[PDB]
Design a binder for this molecule. Structure first.
Ligand SMILES: Nc1ncnc2c1ncn2[C@@H]1O[C@H](COP(=O)(O)OP(=O)(O)O)[C@@H](O)[C@H]1O
Ligand SMILES: Nc1ncnc2c1ncn2[C@@H]1O[C@H](COP(=O)(O)OP(=O)(O)O)[C@@H](O)[C@H]1O
Ligand SMILES: [Mg+2]
Ligand SMILES: [Mg+2]
Lengths: 371, 61, 223, 33
């Protein structure tokens, strides 16, 4: 009797305490990694830890092993903005049958404070950590017949600073394409096809295909490479492939000058019966074969020419290929380079620095060989 | 449906569990949003009528 | 119970120490990794292109040591330094817009060790090899462009008897293709350098020309 | 009554030791070998 009365009151007190306490429990919801990684970084002084081993055995004979430490089964005490917090990771008698036949795991966070503004920060910090850890890669798609499949591993993103055009030429195109993605309601509400056209034209090796490769990586979009010289490509093969393209992707066309006919290209570019959120880019090494009426608004919303290297491009490219050099060396170079050549494309500037890689001052004394 | 309504109706809750959405679309694009639901245990909510005892409990099955 | 593999008890190992310093366990795990890895010995896996696809070719060969191929002094170390510089510097290329690829050309009399050395170099760097002879009958211009576009990571591409080169005009996009994978190292072997075009061996296509001659006085003492 | 009183003091001492005691546990992560 006495024991029963005491026990009932105690339980009620705990419930009242629970109201002025705080509990969080995630169970194998792929939150464990994010939460646990933050815990070890935050504590810096921990005793009971468990070992998880990474066996990244790439198929080359290469074995990569790294150790990721997380707290072990039990409880820990940490110091935070609020009062001391009791963190516990505990095992149970129940079992998981999904993945690996392992014990069900529950992680409990209990705090003294009564404000819940704290955990919102904690969860977000873990998201920051997980996305900082991982690095984004541009996923490339290749048309295998009538469908798209991933091609090799996700390539590393070429930064946008590598393709060096005139000042204000890259920023004006960035403003137009960022406006298109962030305004999906302005189109559908007004019945306009949610599509945007872009054209870059100029001599070969100017950076038409170079810039478009790096732009999608910055915007976290994929690319659909398409050369207009394929043998197994026909008219009906291309209309389908452009309709089942992944979302957040850019369509690229190479050397449009060889157009496939011109009259049949109208419904292909601007088709009313087509998907939404489609961005098209056009590159032609010879503008002297396209009709001027092909590049009007509706099909191309911004006309821009990509020419040879200017002084702004040479000063910056010289600092990329030869960093840590004096600014005057990136003025004597650009001065005498333009004085010995009337027109020079970046593809020739990118190849000239391959003869003196990491060897400054050699480029200024050997400009005459470019004749 | 029930859990979403519980969090929306209370707006002021203590014991909560975290469910993470990992909508990793095949483009390198990772989309993460957090859906909050009550944690393991019991809760009390206020409605037009008197206080209601809500309990969510786990089992050995 | 585990239901994944074999129906066995789930196993946990606990290490408990009295001391308050955690420097101890850091050593324990590291020693254990060393023991298991010393026992096993790495093998170079060879791959051969069967038409438009790749298939394993025989068993993993035993790694021929790099000291077995005995060339002049400083010739093996200069090639190791050049290829180790390429693998250990992936950021220097992409940041400057250069395709992350490296070209190599070996020329000399027949039977000097051009193809022998490449077999041992991949084993030293713990890389695989993709065997490809330039004498196949079912090989065309487009067939070679596809095979060269999906290279395994940490691998070296081998070419046999490039002097007998399939057309030459279709070889341009094959050697230096803008639409190709990253971390790709290509090797070229020709028993007669007097048949290649001088413009074919520039940087971008060939980043190192090297001659393999007869035995010197240093090679006889070592052999 | 008697059993409850004895257990509380003993258990707490172990928790104090946990801070002064290091623990490492791997579970079938292919580190066993
Ligand atoms: N404006 C530029 N800035 C930096 N590099 C460039 C530029 N234009 C071209 N390149 C280099 O030239 C190479 C190929 O250019 P490419 O895209 O084929 O020219 P286009 O597509 O205009 O014919 C790439 O390796 C790229 O790094
Ligand atoms: N420099 C060398 N050192 C040791 N052995 C060599 C060397 N060069 C060739 N050999 C031997 O010659 C044989 C075949 O050589 P091979 O690779 O066909 O020459 P290449 O490829 O230059 O025509 C092998 O059995 C190899 O052991
Ligand atoms: Mg082009
Ligand atoms: Mg040979």
């Amino acid at each position: 009797l006495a024991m029963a009365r005491k026990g009932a009151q105690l339980g009620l007190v705990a419930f009242r305490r629970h109201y002025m306490i705080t509990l969080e429990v995630p169970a194998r919801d792929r939150s464990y990694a994010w939460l646990l990684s933050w815990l070890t970084r935050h504590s810096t002084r921990t005793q009971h830890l468990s070992v998880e081993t990474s066996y990244l055995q790439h198929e080359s004979g290469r074995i990569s092993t790294k150790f990721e430490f997380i707290p072990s089964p039990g409880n820990h005490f940490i110091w935070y903005q609020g009062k001391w917090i009791r963190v516990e990771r505990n095992r149970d008698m129940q079992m998981v049958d999904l993945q690996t036949g392992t014990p069900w795991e529950s992680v409990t966070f209990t705090a003294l404070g009564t404000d819940r503004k704290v955990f919102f920060n904690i969860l977000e910090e873990a998201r920051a950590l997980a996305l900082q850890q991982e690095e984004g890669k541009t996923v490339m798609y290749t048309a295998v017949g009538s469908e798209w499949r991933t091609f090799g591993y996700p390539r590393r993103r070429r930064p946008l600073d590598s393709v060096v055009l005139q000042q204000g030429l890259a920023d004006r195109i960035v403003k137009d394409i960022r406006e298109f993605i962030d305004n999906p309601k302005w189109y559908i509400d007004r019945g306009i096809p949610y599509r945007r056209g872009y054209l870059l034209y100029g001599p070969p090796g100017c950076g038409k295909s170079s810039f478009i490769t790096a732009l999608a990586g910055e915007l976290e979009h994929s690319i659909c490479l398409l050369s207009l010289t394929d043998s197994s490509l026909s008219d009906d093969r291309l209309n389908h492939l452009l309709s089942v393209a992944p979302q957040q992707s850019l369509v690229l066309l190479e050397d449009v000058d060889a157009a496939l006919t011109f009259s049949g290209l109208l419904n292909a570019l601007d088709g009313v019966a087509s998907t939404e959120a489609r961005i098209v880019f056009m590159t032609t090494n010879y503008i002297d074969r396209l009709d001027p009426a092909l590049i009007r608004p509706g099909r191309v919303d911004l006309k821009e020419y990509v020419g040879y290297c200017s002084h702004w491009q040479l000063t910056q490219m010289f600092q990329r290929f030869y960093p840590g050099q004096a600014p005057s060396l990136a003025e004597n170079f650009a001065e005498h380079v333009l004085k010995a050549t009337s027109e020079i494309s970046p593809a020739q500037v990118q190849g000239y620095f391959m003869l003196y890689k990491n060897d400054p001052m050699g480029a200024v004394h050997n400009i005459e060989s470019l004749r």
